[PDB]
Design an enzyme around this catalytic site. Structure first.
Site, PDB file in Angstrom:
ATOM      1  N   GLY A  44      78.422 109.593  53.714  1.00 56.14           N
ATOM      2  CA  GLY A  44      79.804 109.260  53.395  1.00 56.14           C
ATOM      3  C   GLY A  44      80.280 107.961  54.014  1.00 56.14           C
ATOM      4  O   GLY A  44      79.533 107.277  54.726  1.00 56.14           O
ATOM      5  N   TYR A  48      87.147 103.905  59.130  1.00 55.19           N
ATOM      6  CA  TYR A  48      86.543 103.084  60.177  1.00 55.19           C
ATOM      7  C   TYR A  48      85.092 103.498  60.543  1.00 55.19           C
ATOM      8  O   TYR A  48      84.549 102.990  61.521  1.00 55.19           O
ATOM      9  CB  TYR A  48      87.453 103.054  61.428  1.00 55.19           C
ATOM     10  CG  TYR A  48      88.852 102.518  61.182  1.00 55.19           C
ATOM     11  CD1 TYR A  48      89.054 101.200  60.769  1.00 55.19           C
ATOM     12  CD2 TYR A  48      89.973 103.314  61.402  1.00 55.19           C
ATOM     13  CE1 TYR A  48      90.340 100.697  60.556  1.00 55.19           C
ATOM     14  CE2 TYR A  48      91.265 102.820  61.192  1.00 55.19           C
ATOM     15  CZ  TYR A  48      91.443 101.509  60.773  1.00 55.19           C
ATOM     16  OH  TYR A  48      92.712 101.014  60.570  1.00 55.19           O
ATOM     17  N   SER A  49      84.454 104.378  59.746  1.00 60.58           N
ATOM     18  CA  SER A  49      83.090 104.829  60.034  1.00 60.58           C
ATOM     19  C   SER A  49      82.201 104.997  58.806  1.00 60.58           C
ATOM     20  O   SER A  49      82.709 105.184  57.700  1.00 60.58           O
ATOM     21  CB  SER A  49      83.123 106.139  60.824  1.00 60.58           C
ATOM     22  OG  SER A  49      83.568 107.227  60.028  1.00 60.58           O
ATOM     23  N   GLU A  50      80.864 104.953  59.016  1.00 57.52           N
ATOM     24  CA  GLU A  50      79.834 105.171  57.993  1.00 57.52           C
ATOM     25  C   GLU A  50      78.937 106.269  58.546  1.00 57.52           C
ATOM     26  O   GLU A  50      78.443 106.135  59.671  1.00 57.52           O
ATOM     27  CB  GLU A  50      79.022 103.891  57.783  1.00 57.52           C
ATOM     28  CG  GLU A  50      78.632 103.661  56.339  1.00 57.52           C
ATOM     29  CD  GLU A  50      78.382 102.202  56.015  1.00 57.52           C
ATOM     30  OE1 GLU A  50      77.375 101.645  56.513  1.00 57.52           O
ATOM     31  OE2 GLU A  50      79.203 101.611  55.275  1.00 57.52           O
ATOM     32  N   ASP A 154      93.579 116.265  62.172  1.00 58.27           N
ATOM     33  CA  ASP A 154      93.043 115.862  60.861  1.00 58.27           C
ATOM     34  C   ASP A 154      92.322 117.015  60.157  1.00 58.27           C
ATOM     35  O   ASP A 154      91.270 116.845  59.537  1.00 58.27           O
ATOM     36  CB  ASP A 154      92.196 114.584  60.934  1.00 58.27           C
ATOM     37  CG  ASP A 154      91.986 113.925  59.575  1.00 58.27           C
ATOM     38  OD1 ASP A 154      92.749 114.228  58.648  1.00 58.27           O
ATOM     39  OD2 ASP A 154      91.026 113.153  59.433  1.00 58.27           O
TER      40      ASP A 154
END
Ligand SMILES: OCCCNCc1ccc(-c2ccccc2)c(Cl)c1
Length: 326
Positions: A44, A48-50, A154
């Site tokens: 995914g 701000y992340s992979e 979240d």
């Protein structure tokens, strides 16, 4: 100004702990070896992340690598400290290592691998029992992180990984999580739109763990009624209007009156007047096998404007809806 508020449970857990525990800015991070891991495939892409599936080449074990765009060092430190603090808790994703890419100057978090089953494929095969079982597994994770003085902020289906074959659930993505300090005023620009609690939408900054309980209620409503999302706002202002169309405008004014909240003028021409709806109105032929009086009662006790009037994760675990689970 607005009336102050504090959590009804685990209020002073951080106050009674040393600085070491909650002072993430002073936390010393130690890198592992990036060469221990070989990236397999992209899972995914976040704001701000992979996220990647990877192999730990020292033990031939599958892991999950979350590569962070180092946009704000303070936020990276916060997530690392929280993950370290919660490591080993029930149904919490396990942080296994912290590594860096020296060439690109990029941090990465290494987690235990979770064999996630598809959300769109699960949505139809799930039974009343399965919903009760997995909701209880999420509560175990929330009661634990709340007891550790941490709010997730979240909670949403995309942050819940389920390996259905092994009936294993993990609450992931602790990048927006924060230490709860009674009386602190937090940023309301947290959670995903559909899962934002009314406190966020009316800009009431002194919120607590109860925010996570609203988000969980939005997930439960969407599962038992087969309506994704349950509150389908088109923007943050419209989001409160979608909630008001279900909960009614009367109880909304009681909420803002209780905490002396000032409603933003952007709500003046969109809020309207809405009656309080019965939960039975959302029952249809496509979802009636997942709905019961116990489910509705439980849902009613979660989806409340008043953050203080919502069930805590522990009270939720004691509800008749979970009498059938172990
Ligand atoms: O690929 C991203 C991960 C998506 N997780 C799929 C997923 C499947 C089922 C549930 C669920 C919700 C309420 C009650 C019971 C189960 C959740 Cl929260 C999530």
């Amino acid at each position: 100004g607005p009336v102050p508020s504090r959590a009804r449970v685990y209020t002073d857990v951080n106050t009674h702990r040393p600085s070491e525990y909650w002072d993430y800015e002073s936390h010393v991070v130690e890198w592992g070896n990036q060469d221990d891991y070989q990236l397999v495939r992209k899972l995914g892409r976040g704001k701000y992340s992979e996220v990647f599936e990877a192999i730990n080449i020292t033990n031939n074990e599958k892991v999950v690598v979350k590569i962070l765009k180092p946009v704000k060092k303070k936020k990276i430190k916060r997530e690392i400290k929280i993950l370290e603090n919660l490591r080993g808790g029930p149904n919490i994703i396990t942080l296994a290592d912290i590594v860096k890419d020296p060439v690109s100057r990029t941090p990465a978090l290494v987690f235990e691998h979770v064999n996630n089953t598809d959300f769109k494929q699960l949505y139809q095969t799930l039974t009343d029992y399965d919903i009760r079982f997995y909701m209880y597994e999420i509560l175990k994770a929330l009661d634990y992180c709340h007891s550790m003085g941490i709010m997730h902020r979240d909670v949403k289906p995309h942050n819940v990984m389920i390996d259905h074959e092994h009936r294993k659930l993990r609450l992931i993505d602790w990048g927006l999580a924060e230490f709860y300090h009674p009386g602190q005023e937090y940023n309301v620009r947290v959670a995903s739109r559909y899962f934002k609690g009314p406190e966020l939408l009316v800009d009431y900054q002194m919120y607590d763990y109860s925010l996570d309980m609203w988000s969980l209620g939005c997930m439960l409503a969407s599962m038992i009624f087969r309506k994704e999302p349950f509150f389908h706002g088109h923007d943050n202002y419209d989001q409160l209007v979608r909630i008001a169309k279900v909960l009614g405008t009367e109880d909304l004014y009681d909420y803002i009156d209780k905490y002396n909240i000032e409603l933003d003028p952007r709500f003046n021409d969109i809020l309207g007047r809405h009656s309080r709806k019965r939960w039975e109105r959302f029952v249809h032929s496509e979802n009636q096998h997942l709905v019961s009086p116990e489910a509705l009662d439980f849902l009613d006790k979660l989806l409340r404007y008043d953050h203080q009037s919502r069930l805590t994760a522990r009270e939720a675990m004691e509800h008749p809806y979970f009498y059938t689970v172990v």
